């Protein structure tokens, strides 16, 4: 048997039970991965809470780095260059909080030999997200200025470094002075406190951009920042609302987008930017290229035993984590 | 003195009032225009109804073609025939407009066609070239295909090598929409999912690259459901009424799509920008890439009846008021 974190009923971090499960078997198109490091993602909390509904019970999580223990039967091995023994990482696994899990080969990348498994499980899901946000949702160009909320979070630090490397000025928000320094170290040109009032905060942003506003806002915080994000945009700018850490954004009168400057609102999901193995491989390769040139550096921001998934979810929801955190099996 | 159409209280078409006013003088950078044809635009109804607030009382309308009667101090001269979509108080025998947002009318474009084409044609330009830059091979959905904006969007998109699907309310309108270049003309959505199902059948399962939706309340859900992944919903109007607040997670579920609510104001920000869009519009008219028909005429005094017809979905294409 193996250890796993199973959810039998949805609810708070408390429902994350460390239990014995049979080792899974890979199906068609799947690899069986023996975990070395397991990624923690804010979306895990939405599945745990039952926000994002899923069939019960389930072993939680989708991000894992480890070694290929087995390749699914049938045609599978003919359709991938991944082989048993390879160190691999996926953001699309089933039941990642376990010693062993499965993932589609087409949405799994080989880890470069100079990248540790902890860094890979810190980098992939959030790094693919930063990639699509910066290259596809709003393609940043040198000279732009963007706003990135939660600048010292997992996605936040990657967005900040990568945008800075691309010649983009980045303004961030964080909750503590410790996080402010990490954000500056990541390349943020200015770090602000969280908005108290949308117009007040937008004025700060306008001050910094000469009244223009930012070309794009990357908002992964949602409820507490949305109004401020919308108010901070340059004419025809893009609000990429990609997360809801503080809670869901209430229904938006489309005429607000007019008043704000004929802006665009989009709410993307990673699913729509990893639609083929070809697309996934392209983004994963650009991510590992950026890491290996030190265009970005993905630090391991926190580590927990797999059995302490509960503790990680508590710290994450309490705004106590910095950067990417991993579970260790 | 001059005749004008004024609103002293907001409401339905009934609040439109005949008034005589002194002829205006143009301020700095402005032209005084003697109207030959006055444009009618759905936005006129939003100002009349109070849906778009404005300090009362005021004279309705912003689109006019006529001759320059006077210039404010500060290549347009008195005597020149011009058209603007940014005039103040256009439902009148004379009005003012900023010279920087006024175009000279090509000599072979009638004044009615100018007042049928400019506001709506600048809108079609920004929608097709700026909000979502259509590409040859794209398919787009345009609601109200036989309306003023809809006919221009359809012809221009078709010229650009884009496939257009439209909606209209009548068989007469369906014929006009096909003649404008629409590849398929559909009935308005009854069920959003079934409508989207039909659109996906027409696009090889893909959905459309963009929806240009100027109808709003009665089409929005279907527009959203018809999009290709990462497509753009350009909600630029609200003829059927305002779109209810949109849960951003619906944009996720629809395929990580973009939603945008553009205003002509943000696409005519400089004289340079205006001139670029206007020139491309008149180039298209001059080469017959598009042809703007006058779809109806009303006396200035009958602005009430024009607004009644507009809201009752009875107009076909661009309509004008004549002094
Ligand atoms: N759409 C997509 O494809 C994807 C979306 N996401 C989303 O992006 C966001 C970032 O993900 P991830 O890097 O894993 O998480 P983070 O590491 O960014 O952690 C969330 C951070 O948000 C900030 N925050 C502000 N208000 C709150 C609150 N009320 N509760 C908790 N946190 C708050 C906190 O930092 P601070 O101290 O600055 O407040 C916190 O550290 C998440 O919302 C996630 O759901 C992630 C991956 C893919
Ligand atoms: N910059 C911008 O954002 C601009 C936006 N617009 C908007 O674009 C839209 C089209 O403008 P315009 O060409 O002047 O108007 P149209 O000539 O298109 O008239 C509106 C049409 O919409 C259709 N419609 C569908 N449902 C309704 C309803 N319940 N009530 C009334 N009409 C309905 C009707 O035709 P059918 O028989 O097909 O139903 C009607 O003819 C308007 O909503 C306008 O506000 C216009 C200019 C600039």
XYZ file of C-alpha atoms and ligand atoms in Angstrom:
748
model
C 0.000 0.000 0.000
C 1.006 3.669 -0.269
C 0.360 6.824 1.721
C -2.074 9.383 0.265
C -4.171 12.372 1.278
C -7.810 11.537 0.654
C -10.912 13.705 0.891
C -14.018 11.731 1.916
C -16.092 14.820 2.606
C -15.438 18.400 1.499
C -14.698 21.182 4.003
C -11.773 22.864 5.737
C -8.109 21.775 5.836
C -9.197 19.281 8.504
C -10.752 16.931 5.934
C -7.317 16.239 4.425
C -6.804 12.715 5.821
C -3.472 10.884 5.551
C -4.425 7.286 4.689
C -3.319 3.999 3.122
C -4.406 3.405 -0.487
C -3.531 0.767 -3.052
C -0.841 1.918 -5.490
C -2.638 3.144 -8.629
C -2.246 1.602 -12.075
C -1.701 3.846 -15.119
C -4.458 3.731 -17.753
C -4.255 4.410 -21.476
C -2.086 7.463 -22.203
C -0.893 7.577 -18.576
C 2.394 7.344 -16.712
C 2.715 6.079 -13.153
C 4.926 8.505 -11.234
C 6.710 7.763 -7.977
C 6.593 11.148 -6.216
C 9.737 12.980 -5.107
C 8.104 16.367 -4.540
C 4.442 17.376 -4.692
C 3.225 20.848 -5.603
C 0.730 22.738 -3.467
C -1.649 25.010 -5.385
C -4.398 27.365 -4.282
C -6.836 25.472 -6.498
C -6.268 22.422 -4.284
C -8.127 24.332 -1.558
C -11.153 24.921 -3.827
C -11.422 21.179 -4.511
C -10.908 20.375 -0.847
C -13.619 22.859 0.163
C -16.044 21.624 -2.501
C -16.050 25.031 -4.186
C -14.885 23.409 -7.378
C -17.081 20.289 -7.210
C -15.625 16.820 -7.733
C -16.784 13.239 -7.129
C -16.123 11.891 -3.608
C -13.933 10.460 -2.351
C -10.760 11.557 -4.132
C -7.013 11.818 -3.568
C -6.288 15.535 -3.983
C -3.765 17.554 -6.045
C -2.477 17.768 -9.614
C 1.191 18.802 -9.471
C 3.961 16.216 -8.973
C 7.594 15.665 -9.833
C 9.066 12.176 -9.582
C 10.300 9.135 -11.474
C 8.364 7.140 -14.048
C 7.653 3.830 -12.302
C 5.538 2.461 -15.163
C 3.982 3.439 -18.487
C 0.318 2.661 -19.188
C -0.471 -0.499 -21.195
C -1.558 -0.620 -24.821
C -0.554 2.074 -27.279
C 0.749 4.517 -24.596
C 4.499 3.873 -24.863
C 4.385 4.327 -28.642
C 2.990 7.849 -28.230
C 5.583 9.319 -25.870
C 9.355 9.651 -25.611
C 9.057 9.411 -21.811
C 10.440 6.117 -20.447
C 10.459 4.223 -17.141
C 13.135 5.750 -14.914
C 12.804 9.288 -16.299
C 12.436 12.206 -13.866
C 9.259 13.993 -14.911
C 6.855 16.683 -13.785
C 3.166 17.301 -14.483
C 0.557 19.837 -13.450
C -2.245 17.577 -14.692
C -1.869 14.501 -12.492
C -4.662 12.595 -10.767
C -4.226 12.199 -7.007
C -0.866 13.972 -6.683
C -0.818 14.055 -2.852
C 0.429 10.449 -2.632
C 3.570 8.355 -2.953
C 2.404 7.336 -6.432
C 0.007 8.943 -8.900
C -0.892 8.920 -12.586
C -0.587 11.660 -15.198
C -1.245 11.909 -18.939
C 2.061 11.509 -20.797
C 1.099 14.356 -23.163
C 0.874 16.763 -20.192
C 4.076 15.589 -18.499
C 7.536 17.075 -19.084
C 10.978 15.586 -18.545
C 12.875 17.478 -15.861
C 16.303 18.807 -16.966
C 19.231 17.121 -15.218
C 20.277 20.364 -13.476
C 16.835 20.992 -11.916
C 15.925 19.374 -8.590
C 12.617 17.617 -8.115
C 11.614 20.150 -5.429
C 12.231 23.062 -7.794
C 10.342 21.291 -10.605
C 7.293 20.775 -8.346
C 7.611 24.400 -7.309
C 7.810 25.616 -10.888
C 5.612 23.737 -13.364
C 1.919 24.487 -12.709
C 2.590 28.041 -11.609
C 5.256 28.607 -14.278
C 3.011 27.367 -17.102
C 0.440 29.783 -15.716
C 2.862 32.725 -15.706
C 3.846 31.760 -19.259
C 0.323 31.791 -20.672
C -0.509 34.963 -18.736
C 2.533 36.842 -20.127
C 2.701 35.330 -23.609
C -0.915 34.546 -24.557
C -3.551 36.257 -22.400
C -1.812 39.614 -22.635
C 1.442 39.449 -24.599
C 3.663 41.830 -22.632
C 6.134 43.956 -24.571
C 9.220 45.863 -23.473
C 8.106 49.209 -22.038
C 4.799 48.020 -20.613
C 3.879 48.367 -16.954
C 1.747 45.681 -15.316
C 0.157 45.189 -11.900
C 0.600 41.799 -10.210
C -1.319 41.175 -6.989
C 0.177 38.876 -4.312
C 3.677 39.564 -5.612
C 5.345 37.159 -3.153
C 3.065 34.191 -3.867
C 3.943 31.227 -6.079
C 2.587 32.629 -9.329
C 3.352 36.204 -8.294
C 7.114 35.778 -7.976
C 7.319 33.964 -11.321
C 5.236 36.635 -13.089
C 7.405 39.372 -11.596
C 10.743 37.844 -12.557
C 9.651 36.797 -16.021
C 7.977 40.108 -16.892
C 11.024 42.009 -15.572
C 13.266 39.867 -17.782
C 11.033 40.780 -20.737
C 11.577 44.517 -20.085
C 8.269 45.092 -18.281
C 7.915 47.350 -15.241
C 6.071 45.496 -12.484
C 4.038 46.930 -9.626
C 2.951 44.437 -6.955
C 0.835 44.164 -3.821
C 1.853 42.162 -0.729
C 0.700 41.859 2.886
C 4.003 42.137 4.830
C 7.368 43.886 4.744
C 9.062 40.456 4.469
C 7.061 39.786 1.306
C 7.796 43.277 0.028
C 11.529 42.553 0.012
C 11.085 39.211 -1.784
C 8.951 41.009 -4.362
C 11.611 43.702 -4.863
C 14.294 41.003 -5.134
C 12.107 39.380 -7.804
C 12.272 42.620 -9.769
C 9.158 44.541 -8.739
C 9.788 48.221 -9.374
C 7.294 49.343 -6.732
C 5.476 47.406 -4.005
C 2.104 48.640 -2.709
C -0.180 47.669 0.139
C -3.516 46.029 -0.635
C -6.247 48.445 -1.766
C -8.514 49.910 0.904
C -10.461 51.930 -1.623
C -10.429 51.293 -5.381
C -10.024 54.934 -6.400
C -7.390 55.598 -3.736
C -5.333 52.623 -4.901
C -5.888 53.437 -8.582
C -4.527 56.916 -7.879
C -1.298 55.370 -6.525
C -0.966 53.305 -9.704
C -1.769 56.356 -11.861
C 0.854 58.357 -9.939
C 3.457 55.729 -10.817
C 2.438 55.484 -14.460
C 1.878 59.194 -15.071
C -1.900 58.943 -15.033
C -1.794 56.326 -17.816
C -2.514 53.247 -15.744
C -1.078 49.786 -16.419
C -1.258 47.892 -19.747
C -2.478 44.798 -17.879
C -3.426 43.650 -14.393
C -2.734 40.088 -13.332
C -5.199 39.549 -10.484
C -5.083 36.221 -8.655
C -6.690 37.595 -5.500
C -10.224 38.289 -6.692
C -12.809 39.719 -4.295
C -10.649 42.219 -2.360
C -8.682 43.576 -5.312
C -10.944 43.399 -8.390
C -12.461 46.894 -8.175
C -8.988 48.373 -7.708
C -7.549 46.300 -10.570
C -10.302 47.464 -12.905
C -9.769 51.114 -11.864
C -6.000 50.927 -12.477
C -6.031 50.067 -16.198
C -4.744 52.009 -19.180
C -7.218 52.612 -22.010
C -8.010 49.303 -23.750
C -5.921 47.473 -21.150
C -6.442 43.848 -20.121
C -7.671 42.658 -16.737
C -6.599 39.034 -16.419
C -8.538 37.743 -13.420
C -6.877 34.347 -12.990
C -7.534 33.572 -9.320
C -9.784 34.177 -6.327
C -7.616 33.683 -3.226
C -9.534 36.292 -1.195
C -12.871 34.968 -2.444
C -14.950 35.052 -5.641
C -15.454 38.253 -7.662
C -19.135 39.350 -7.653
C -20.954 39.643 -11.039
C -19.507 42.517 -13.105
C -21.738 45.007 -14.947
C -20.140 44.983 -18.427
C -20.617 48.761 -18.603
C -17.950 48.998 -15.909
C -15.511 47.821 -18.593
C -16.608 50.727 -20.773
C -16.211 53.344 -18.032
C -12.814 51.889 -17.083
C -11.482 52.583 -20.586
C -13.033 50.085 -23.053
C -10.934 47.446 -21.360
C -10.880 43.679 -21.723
C -11.818 41.299 -18.934
C -10.745 37.679 -19.146
C -10.882 34.818 -16.638
C -8.491 32.152 -17.913
C -7.874 28.581 -16.788
C -4.660 26.594 -17.423
C -6.823 23.912 -19.056
C -7.369 26.141 -22.117
C -3.642 26.801 -22.550
C -2.519 23.154 -22.415
C -4.929 21.868 -25.057
C -2.459 19.587 -26.847
C 0.813 17.871 -26.000
C 2.361 20.235 -28.519
C 1.107 23.335 -26.706
C 2.043 21.970 -23.304
C 5.542 21.062 -24.499
C 6.081 24.526 -25.947
C 5.204 26.301 -22.696
C 7.148 23.816 -20.551
C 10.232 24.263 -22.745
C 10.056 28.079 -22.592
C 9.698 27.766 -18.795
C 12.774 25.551 -18.428
C 14.678 27.798 -20.839
C 13.919 30.777 -18.571
C 14.954 28.901 -15.456
C 18.227 27.711 -16.990
C 19.205 31.142 -18.254
C 18.311 32.526 -14.814
C 15.760 34.781 -16.494
C 13.765 33.446 -13.568
C 14.738 31.524 -10.442
C 12.028 29.450 -8.759
C 12.831 29.131 -5.065
C 11.307 26.465 -2.844
C 9.351 28.738 -0.495
C 8.223 26.128 2.003
C 8.339 22.392 2.639
C 5.963 20.079 4.495
C 5.750 16.337 5.042
C 3.050 14.791 2.823
C 1.151 13.822 5.967
C 1.004 17.511 6.893
C -0.975 18.591 3.825
C -3.463 19.964 6.376
C -0.827 22.314 7.778
C 0.126 23.542 4.305
C -3.487 24.315 3.435
C -3.844 26.242 6.706
C -0.710 28.325 6.080
C -1.657 28.936 2.440
C -5.178 30.138 3.269
C -3.840 32.255 6.138
C -1.518 34.204 3.792
C 1.497 32.843 5.671
C 3.364 31.165 2.806
C 5.911 32.787 0.516
C 6.571 31.521 -2.996
C 5.893 27.940 -4.033
C 5.465 25.305 -1.364
C 5.872 21.546 -1.753
C 4.824 18.394 0.081
C 7.548 15.791 0.624
C 6.578 12.068 0.567
C -33.366 80.956 -34.798
C -33.395 77.272 -35.775
C -35.509 74.173 -35.182
C -34.150 71.542 -32.806
C -35.223 68.454 -30.864
C -34.727 68.835 -27.115
C -35.093 66.639 -24.048
C -36.052 68.368 -20.763
C -36.860 65.131 -18.952
C -35.688 61.601 -19.743
C -38.112 58.848 -20.768
C -39.564 57.177 -23.862
C -39.831 58.660 -27.378
C -42.635 60.866 -26.062
C -40.196 63.136 -24.208
C -38.650 64.386 -27.471
C -39.710 68.064 -27.829
C -39.724 70.542 -30.683
C -37.913 73.736 -29.706
C -36.632 76.800 -31.499
C -33.231 77.972 -30.337
C -30.865 80.722 -31.367
C -28.302 79.492 -33.877
C -25.171 78.468 -31.919
C -21.734 80.032 -32.312
C -18.808 77.612 -32.509
C -16.276 77.715 -29.682
C -12.512 77.330 -29.998
C -11.520 74.533 -32.373
C -15.165 73.984 -33.303
C -17.113 74.136 -36.556
C -20.688 75.387 -36.928
C -22.418 72.947 -39.278
C -25.605 73.601 -41.232
C -27.240 70.169 -41.408
C -28.116 68.468 -44.686
C -28.687 65.042 -43.076
C -28.664 64.068 -39.398
C -27.635 60.590 -38.268
C -29.854 58.461 -36.061
C -28.102 56.178 -33.618
C -29.252 53.758 -30.975
C -27.149 55.688 -28.431
C -29.499 58.653 -28.985
C -32.153 56.534 -27.279
C -29.923 55.764 -24.262
C -29.389 59.486 -23.687
C -33.096 60.144 -24.217
C -34.066 57.391 -21.750
C -31.540 58.414 -19.111
C -29.758 55.054 -19.354
C -26.772 57.210 -20.250
C -26.925 60.183 -17.882
C -26.420 63.730 -19.161
C -27.147 67.195 -17.686
C -30.659 68.258 -18.694
C -31.938 69.890 -20.830
C -30.060 69.022 -23.970
C -30.467 68.606 -27.726
C -30.231 64.970 -28.857
C -27.705 63.438 -31.247
C -24.068 63.546 -32.317
C -23.964 62.595 -35.985
C -24.371 65.182 -38.721
C -23.357 65.931 -42.275
C -23.655 69.472 -43.612
C -21.801 72.589 -44.650
C -19.436 74.596 -42.488
C -21.308 77.800 -41.700
C -18.705 79.244 -39.319
C -15.466 78.318 -37.604
C -14.294 78.937 -34.085
C -10.970 80.699 -33.785
C -7.982 78.353 -33.594
C -7.797 72.199 -43.756
C -11.541 72.678 -43.204
C -13.022 76.067 -44.247
C -16.411 77.768 -44.205
C -18.384 76.410 -47.173
C -16.915 72.891 -46.994
C -19.128 69.812 -46.739
C -18.281 67.776 -43.680
C -19.456 65.000 -41.397
C -18.889 64.334 -37.675
C -19.974 61.648 -35.185
C -18.960 63.833 -32.227
C -21.217 66.875 -32.640
C -23.140 68.542 -29.832
C -26.885 68.749 -30.390
C -27.091 67.196 -33.858
C -30.917 66.975 -34.031
C -31.101 70.606 -35.170
C -30.759 72.755 -38.269
C -27.307 73.850 -37.039
C -24.893 72.356 -34.534
C -21.272 72.407 -33.416
C -18.538 69.764 -33.694
C -14.795 69.681 -32.974
C -12.799 70.145 -36.178
C -10.357 67.446 -35.045
C -13.243 64.942 -35.085
C -14.851 66.112 -38.334
C -14.063 64.681 -41.785
C -14.484 66.292 -45.171
C -17.104 64.379 -47.178
C -15.790 62.944 -50.474
C -17.375 64.827 -53.362
C -19.189 61.741 -54.659
C -20.657 60.695 -51.311
C -24.142 62.079 -50.723
C -24.816 63.925 -47.491
C -27.338 61.256 -46.453
C -24.799 58.496 -47.021
C -22.231 60.438 -45.008
C -24.682 60.734 -42.075
C -25.542 57.043 -42.541
C -21.913 55.922 -42.536
C -19.623 57.860 -40.240
C -20.538 57.056 -36.631
C -21.450 53.467 -37.448
C -18.549 53.037 -39.885
C -15.941 54.319 -37.427
C -17.491 51.829 -35.027
C -17.201 48.979 -37.556
C -13.579 50.005 -38.183
C -12.535 49.912 -34.540
C -14.480 46.678 -33.930
C -12.847 44.873 -36.866
C -9.344 46.342 -36.692
C -8.759 47.215 -33.050
C -11.025 45.411 -30.572
C -10.614 42.105 -32.335
C -8.374 42.272 -35.404
C -10.141 39.886 -37.761
C -8.017 37.721 -40.068
C -8.797 36.066 -43.371
C -10.213 32.649 -42.512
C -11.946 33.796 -39.313
C -15.676 33.345 -38.720
C -17.526 35.968 -36.679
C -21.052 36.328 -35.352
C -22.738 39.726 -35.837
C -26.117 40.233 -34.166
C -28.714 42.539 -35.828
C -27.153 41.993 -39.234
C -29.531 44.374 -41.041
C -29.032 47.282 -38.654
C -26.828 50.265 -39.395
C -23.666 48.942 -37.734
C -24.499 45.348 -38.668
C -24.609 45.898 -42.433
C -21.274 47.712 -42.417
C -19.589 45.132 -40.142
C -20.841 42.407 -42.494
C -19.654 43.997 -45.718
C -16.303 45.086 -44.315
C -15.583 41.744 -42.651
C -16.539 39.904 -45.857
C -14.187 42.158 -47.822
C -11.417 41.214 -45.382
C -11.917 37.513 -46.112
C -13.913 36.823 -42.948
C -16.956 34.526 -42.810
C -19.950 36.210 -41.170
C -22.930 34.663 -39.413
C -25.760 37.058 -38.503
C -29.090 37.273 -36.697
C -32.101 39.316 -37.885
C -35.807 39.430 -37.011
C -37.464 39.329 -40.473
C -37.211 37.770 -43.903
C -36.699 41.201 -45.507
C -33.762 41.788 -43.191
C -32.415 38.287 -43.828
C -32.267 39.018 -47.552
C -30.401 42.291 -46.959
C -27.944 40.606 -44.622
C -27.102 37.915 -47.191
C -26.689 40.598 -49.850
C -24.269 42.359 -47.479
C -22.180 39.190 -47.539
C -23.446 37.144 -44.594
C -22.745 33.467 -45.205
C -25.487 32.246 -42.860
C -28.398 34.262 -41.451
C -30.012 32.839 -38.309
C -33.049 33.548 -36.205
C -32.392 35.213 -32.841
C -31.502 32.784 -30.019
C -34.389 31.237 -28.095
C -32.204 28.892 -26.100
C -28.569 29.938 -25.717
C -27.244 26.371 -25.717
C -29.191 25.345 -28.822
C -28.183 28.526 -30.627
C -24.519 27.964 -29.720
C -24.938 24.359 -30.824
C -25.989 25.604 -34.243
C -23.070 28.050 -34.435
C -20.642 25.285 -33.536
C -22.133 23.055 -36.280
C -21.492 25.888 -38.731
C -17.865 26.333 -37.650
C -16.654 22.730 -37.652
C -17.225 22.424 -33.905
C -14.919 25.365 -33.207
C -17.281 28.253 -32.449
C -16.586 31.797 -33.714
C -13.362 33.786 -33.264
C -15.408 36.783 -32.124
C -18.983 37.919 -31.500
C -19.979 41.506 -32.209
C -23.040 41.944 -30.022
C -24.925 45.242 -30.160
C -28.222 43.757 -28.942
C -27.278 43.014 -25.342
C -29.860 41.538 -22.965
C -31.553 39.037 -25.294
C -28.438 37.722 -27.050
C -25.628 37.909 -24.504
C -25.817 34.365 -23.131
C -25.898 32.879 -26.638
C -23.023 35.111 -27.754
C -20.946 33.876 -24.824
C -21.795 30.224 -25.536
C -20.898 30.496 -29.248
C -17.260 31.518 -28.845
C -14.202 29.538 -29.833
C -11.702 28.987 -27.016
C -9.993 32.298 -26.105
C -12.374 34.123 -28.451
C -13.518 37.723 -27.978
C -17.029 38.836 -27.077
C -17.267 42.478 -28.156
C -20.395 43.718 -26.401
C -20.717 47.154 -28.002
C -24.434 47.766 -27.650
C -27.622 47.102 -25.737
C -30.527 47.521 -28.197
C -32.668 44.912 -26.392
C -31.706 46.326 -23.008
C -28.689 46.230 -20.667
C -26.730 43.032 -20.066
C -27.087 41.828 -16.423
C -23.891 41.709 -14.284
C -21.645 38.871 -15.540
C -20.048 36.314 -13.180
C -16.421 36.330 -14.367
C -16.294 32.553 -13.942
C -18.691 32.324 -16.907
C -15.786 33.619 -19.034
C -13.685 30.718 -17.762
C -16.334 28.085 -18.493
C -16.975 29.562 -21.955
C -13.363 28.857 -22.901
C -11.113 31.429 -21.210
C -12.732 34.045 -23.429
C -12.319 37.816 -23.375
C -15.224 40.145 -22.670
C -14.956 43.799 -23.634
C -17.441 46.687 -23.702
C -15.969 49.300 -26.058
C -17.011 52.921 -26.678
C -16.220 54.951 -29.814
C -14.798 57.601 -27.459
C -11.771 55.411 -26.691
C -11.046 54.850 -30.398
C -11.173 58.513 -31.480
C -8.750 59.813 -28.863
C -6.742 62.056 -31.154
C -7.413 63.829 -34.435
C -4.774 61.503 -35.897
C -6.682 58.435 -34.765
C -9.990 59.815 -36.045
C -8.452 60.708 -39.393
C -6.947 57.253 -39.841
C -10.230 55.462 -39.174
C -12.236 57.922 -41.259
C -9.852 57.619 -44.221
C -10.017 53.834 -44.183
C -13.814 54.045 -44.016
C -14.015 56.381 -47.006
C -11.420 54.307 -48.909
C -13.660 51.257 -48.476
C -16.683 53.213 -49.641
C -14.736 54.626 -52.590
C -13.573 51.221 -53.801
C -17.024 49.672 -53.161
C -15.548 47.263 -50.619
C -18.602 48.432 -48.705
C -21.702 50.323 -49.843
C -23.708 52.273 -47.276
C -27.361 52.491 -48.212
C -29.798 55.014 -46.767
C -32.324 52.734 -45.098
C -34.920 55.324 -44.155
C -35.582 59.054 -43.801
C -37.659 61.080 -41.339
C -38.339 64.798 -41.077
C -36.423 66.417 -38.170
C -39.850 67.260 -36.711
C -40.674 63.526 -36.668
C -37.781 62.409 -34.445
C -40.449 60.871 -32.186
C -41.540 58.520 -34.981
C -37.901 57.700 -35.820
C -37.213 56.701 -32.216
C -40.457 54.686 -32.082
C -39.474 52.803 -35.227
C -35.926 52.245 -33.988
C -37.013 50.734 -30.670
C -39.761 48.666 -32.333
C -37.107 46.971 -34.515
C -38.813 48.399 -37.604
C -35.848 50.232 -39.111
C -33.723 48.602 -41.769
C -30.089 49.729 -42.029
C -28.994 53.318 -41.369
C -31.708 55.980 -41.073
C -31.433 59.776 -41.186
C -33.356 62.873 -40.197
C -33.739 65.587 -42.828
C -34.133 69.273 -42.038
N -6.354 30.221 -13.621
C -5.280 29.435 -13.570
O -4.929 28.757 -14.519
C -4.476 29.394 -12.305
C -4.831 30.221 -11.250
N -4.160 30.228 -10.096
C -4.597 31.149 -9.047
O -3.595 32.152 -8.876
C -3.466 32.509 -7.502
C -2.041 32.254 -7.034
O -1.837 30.855 -6.856
P -0.665 30.318 -5.898
O 0.631 30.930 -6.357
O -0.811 28.824 -5.782
O -1.066 30.956 -4.481
P -0.142 32.044 -3.752
O 1.169 31.392 -3.416
O -0.154 33.314 -4.552
O -0.957 32.288 -2.388
C -2.096 33.142 -2.374
C -1.629 34.536 -1.990
O -2.647 35.508 -2.235
C -2.553 36.556 -1.271
N -3.862 36.813 -0.629
C -4.503 37.992 -0.593
N -5.668 37.893 0.090
C -5.780 36.624 0.516
C -6.766 35.844 1.296
N -7.892 36.424 1.767
N -6.502 34.540 1.521
C -5.383 33.958 1.056
N -4.447 34.604 0.344
C -4.584 35.915 0.043
C -1.601 36.082 -0.182
O -0.402 36.845 -0.213
P -0.354 38.326 0.413
O 0.492 38.180 1.645
O 0.285 39.161 -0.658
O -1.792 38.654 0.693
C -1.322 34.629 -0.506
O 0.030 34.268 -0.221
C -4.455 31.649 -6.742
O -5.632 32.422 -6.517
C -4.777 30.508 -7.681
O -6.119 30.061 -7.477
C -3.093 29.445 -9.911
C -2.642 28.573 -10.895
C -3.293 28.460 -12.195
N -18.965 52.693 -29.892
C -19.999 51.912 -29.597
O -19.977 51.140 -28.653
C -21.225 51.979 -30.457
C -22.279 51.117 -30.195
N -23.398 51.127 -30.920
C -24.452 50.171 -30.579
O -24.605 49.227 -31.638
C -25.971 48.830 -31.759
C -26.455 49.050 -33.184
O -26.523 50.450 -33.439
P -27.401 51.033 -34.651
O -26.838 50.516 -35.950
O -27.549 52.516 -34.434
O -28.839 50.364 -34.391
P -29.496 49.276 -35.373
O -29.824 49.918 -36.693
O -28.642 48.041 -35.327
O -30.871 48.976 -34.602
C -30.879 48.069 -33.507
C -31.296 46.717 -34.057
O -31.121 45.686 -33.088
C -32.094 44.668 -33.312
N -32.802 44.299 -32.065
C -32.841 43.076 -31.515
N -33.595 43.068 -30.391
C -34.067 44.312 -30.215
C -34.928 44.999 -29.229
N -35.451 44.331 -28.175
N -35.173 46.313 -29.415
C -34.660 46.987 -30.456
N -33.873 46.429 -31.388
C -33.545 45.120 -31.326
C -33.140 45.245 -34.256
O -33.097 44.592 -35.515
P -33.572 43.062 -35.648
O -34.710 43.101 -36.625
O -32.352 42.351 -36.155
O -33.970 42.671 -34.253
C -32.768 46.701 -34.419
O -32.994 47.146 -35.756
C -26.754 49.680 -30.777
O -27.016 48.896 -29.617
C -25.819 50.808 -30.404
O -26.041 51.205 -29.052
C -23.551 51.966 -31.950
C -22.563 52.877 -32.308
C -21.297 52.973 -31.593
